[PDB]
Chains A and B, each alone.
With several copies, the nearest count.
Chain A
Amino acid sequence: GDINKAMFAIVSFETCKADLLKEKDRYHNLNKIDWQSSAPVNEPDHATTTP
């Protein structure tokens, strides 16, 4: 019953490659991910208003 006692919290959000590339040092291993065909249609748990 206390958020301070919680061990972990997980959040899913939508982001684009430009947002990650704003700060290149923090993010690594961007080359492996298939940006050209990976879509949020593949992930149904995320609830959003995007078509």
Chain B
Amino acid sequence: FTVMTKMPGKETADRNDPYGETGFSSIKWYYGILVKRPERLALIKTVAPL
């Protein structure tokens, strides 16, 4: 992950907002898998009783 917290007051100051009031917090990540042996994954599809 990559957590980024910009608390309001000194970093959120801007020309459109000289008055630091706004803040945020963003978390982002990459993901992906590689399948080597597909035949070793086994699945059964079925109906489940209520």
B1-26 vs A, Cβ < 8 Å mask (1 yes, 0 no):
00101110000000000000000000
State which size class the interface on A falls in. Answer: under 10
- Which residue of chain A is the closest to B27 with respect to CB atoms? A41
Q: Say how far A35's CB is from chain B's closest CB, in angstroms.
A: 20
Task: Point out the residues of chain B lying under 8 angstroms from A44, CB to CB.
Answer: 5-7
Contact partners of B3 in chain A: CB under 8 A: 41
Least distance between A49 CB and chain B CB atoms (Å): 15
Report which B residues bind A (CB closer than 8 A).
Answer: 3, 5-7
For the complex of A and B, 4 pairs with smallest distance between CB atoms = A44-B5, A41-B3, A44-B7, A41-B5
Q: Can you give 6 A-B contacts (C-beta < 8 A)?
A: A41-B3, A41-B5, A42-B5, A44-B5, A44-B6, A44-B7
